[PDB]
């Protein structure tokens, strides 16, 4: 929405390394390649499709905006 | 959102420290910088975007007046 | 709708309740207010609880059902 | 809801004791007093409102048609 | 939409294929799909229990199906 | 949509993938088919996986992205 999109898009455009924490406790790390209404593609060695419904928090490695 | 929006907006506007408990049991702390229909941006020692679907409760450090 | 009048009765009559979360945690207090997605619980700890994180709402006494 | 509603209504009307297992593993028991799109009211000692999103299964104590 | 799910469940139902339904909490239910709608599946063995799809992780047939 | 073309690439190229569920369980195989709500995973035993129970889809090798 009005916050989530610009936030993720800024992270995407600025290629900021992020830590994505899943609801189960697992921590994912990488950079946001792209995202749509339901998923986020996290890129590194091999990219992976993360369902937003499985995400708890997105923590940037450095301050943004 | 007749209650949620005014509540979160008051916490935000008044810089009220809050504790956000996640469904998995993890406790997040800080002040609400902004929010929308699905996420809340928390800031202080660790700035982060929290998905509401992962939140169980939001406990203000002090009660909120609407 | 049954959820709304049920909650409104608990609210209006200031009935003490126990709100059990999906993670097993038990919250206690009286419902101060609520909307489509959240419930504001108050007494010992004032907090906004997301309904999506609630498993059950158990009143301390029987109440008029809708 | 061509199946859910008739099923729950049958259990409600016939007052069939049921076991409602929650997604977290807890087992609730009693009779279905009523239900709507999102919740089910279960009666035992005091009635409790159960959110369907927290329910995994509804198991009747005896078979029903 | 349901171009895969519906035909899949209906085939399992019509052919009475033994199936295992794994829930998100880890529970494994066994039996056969007797019926289903948009939100639930009726699984039959000892008694027919209603399973909410939201609580299901996977549906695994006892044998391949076409 | 980003999800559909991505899943379709995995499907068409028959790419080996790991599907991690929200409860931490790891499933392996390949995407045989999918619709708006489910994915058909093929390996030693085929199974229908509900997307709501999936946390991440990880291919065994880099693939073309949407």
Curated annotation (Swiss-Prot), chain E:
Cellular component GO terms held in the UniProt record: cytosol
Keyword RNA-binding: yes
Origin: domain of life: Bacteria
Alphabetized UniProt keyword annotations: RNA-binding, Stress response
GO molecular function, one term: RNA binding
Keyword RNA-binding set for record: yes
Residue ranges of domain Sm in the record: 6-65
GO biological process: quorum sensing; regulation of carbon utilization; regulation of DNA-templated transcription; regulation of RNA stability; regulation of translation; regulation of translation, ncRNA-mediated
Subunit composition and interactions: Homohexamer.
Function: RNA chaperone that binds small regulatory RNA (sRNAs) and mRNAs to facilitate mRNA translational regulation in response to envelope stress, environmental stress and changes in metabolite concentrations. Also binds with high specificity to tRNAs.
Family statement: Belongs to the Hfq family.
Name the record gives this protein: RNA-binding protein Hfq
Gene coding for it: hfq
């Amino acid at each position: 929405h009005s916050l989530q999109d610009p936030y993720l898009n800024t992270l995407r455009k600025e290629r900021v390394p992020v830590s994505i924490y899943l609801v189960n406790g697992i921590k994912l790390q990488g950079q946001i390649e792209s995202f749509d209404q339901f998923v986020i593609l996290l890129k590194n060695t091999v990219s992976q499709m993360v369902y937003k419904h499985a995400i708890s928090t997105v923590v940037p490695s450095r301050p943004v905006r």
